[PDB]
A = this chain, B = another copy of it.
Amino acid sequence: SQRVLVEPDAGAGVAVMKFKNPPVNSLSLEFLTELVISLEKLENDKSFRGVILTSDRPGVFSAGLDLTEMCGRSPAHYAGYWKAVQELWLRLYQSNLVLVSAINGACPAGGCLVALTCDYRILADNPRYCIGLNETQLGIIAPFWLKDTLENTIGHRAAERALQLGLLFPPAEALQVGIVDQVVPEEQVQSTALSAIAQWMAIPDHARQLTKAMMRKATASRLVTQRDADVQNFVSFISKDSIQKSLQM
Contact = CB atoms under 8 A, between A and B. Distances in A.
Interface in A111-154: 119-120, 135-142, 144, 147, 151-154
Interface stretch (A20-28, A39-47, A63-71, A196-204): A196-204
A244 interface: no
Listed residue (A144, A165, A199) with the most chain B CB atoms within 10 angstroms of its CB: A165
A215 B147 contact: yes
Give the interface size class of chain A: 35 or more
A136 B204 contact: yes
A73 interface: no
A229 to B, nearest CB: 14
A33 interface: no
B208 A164 contact: yes
Q: Is the interface of A mostly helix, strand, loop or mixed?
A: helix
Interface string A155-168: 11101110111100
A174 to B, nearest CB: 13
Given A139-B206, A155-B156, A165-B203, 10 more contacts: A120-B161, A136-B211, A138-B204, A142-B214, A144-B214, A152-B157, A161-B181, A164-B212, A164-B215, A204-B246
